[PDB]
Design a protein around this ligand. Structure first.
Ligand SMILES: O=C1NC(=O)[C@@H](c2ccccc2)S1
Ligand SMILES: [Zn+2]
Length: 258
């Protein structure tokens, strides 16, 4: 597969190799804040990242992933809409060429400068590969980024990006604390959806925080210096690696808050 974000291989093309692209529970979606309903039954959300073990950061040609040790329950997401225990495997971002675009989800059609995805898999399936074949296999915690003040807990990530400029480059990335990426509030929206990149599998419980985090223009400018290409190839800046909103179809977006 040669999918990506260009005119020729971007989201509009994905359906030809991955027909579920046109499925019934695709992500991202627009979150209409006036249609989403408070659900008083949602249990409280539990983000337990005290024992998180980061390992490595990888430019995969599409984004950069901060990978964790997910061989035990070290950093887990529980509660909210979720039954059972979901293990953090990695986080990454999607971002734009300009501060007015970059997020995958939108809020009343507003696009943020970027969106953070903390990916977790349901430990009842044993491994990530099995979990992505299940409707309840993953939980993604999505956090919007707006441009304003710097986010101090992001700066270790932006500082290593020079070392992973091109596709296939990785760097050791131990002792990174992903708590430093969260906003104050854990108020959220939730809905059933999909992976936002091929293979586009309909395996995700989406949990999208209401409160964006602020990052500085300088921080996001450094995301934009990354490259989709490999070393020694013609430079194609890694920007606008987001999929646009997809049809909601027969789904409800629930709010955790009034
Ligand atoms: O949150 C998401 N963003 C992505 O790129 C999708 C994905 C695809 C493959 C592995 C992990 C995550 S799901
Ligand atoms: Zn993502």
């Amino acid at each position: 597969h040669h999918w990506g974000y260009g005119k020729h291989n971007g989201p509009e093309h994905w359906h030809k190799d991955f027909p579920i692209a046109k499925g019934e529970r695709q992500s991202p979606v627009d979150i209409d804040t006036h249609t989403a309903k408070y659900d008083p039954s949602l249990k409280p959300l539990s983000v337990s990242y005290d024992q998180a073990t980061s390992l490595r950061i990888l430019n995969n040609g599409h984004a950069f992933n901060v990978e964790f040790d997910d061989s035990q329950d070290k950093a887990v997401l529980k509660g909210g809409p979720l039954d059972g225990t979901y293990r953090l495997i990695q986080f990454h971002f999607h971002w734009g060429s300009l501060d007015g675009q970059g997020s995958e989800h939108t809020v009343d059609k507003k696009k943020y400068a970027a969106e953070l995805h903390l990916v977790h898999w349901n430990t009842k399936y044993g491994d990530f590969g099995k979990a992505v074949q299940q409707p309840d296999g993953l939980a993604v915690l999505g956090i919007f980024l707006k441009v304003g003040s710097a986010k101090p807990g992001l700066q270790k990530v932006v500082d290593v990006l020079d070392s992973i400029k091109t596709k296939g480059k990785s760097a050791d990335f131990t002792n990174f604390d992903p708590r430093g990426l969260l906003p104050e509030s854990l108020d959220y929206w939730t809905y059933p959806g999909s992976l936002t990149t091929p293979p586009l599998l309909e395996c995700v419980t989406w949990i999208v925080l209401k409160e964006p985090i602020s990052v500085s223009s300088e921080q996001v400018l450094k995301f934009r210096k990354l490259n989709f290409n490999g070393e020694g190839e013609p430079e194609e800046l890694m920007v606008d690696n987001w999929r646009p909103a997809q049809p909601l179809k027969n789904r409800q977006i629930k709010a955790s808050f009034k």
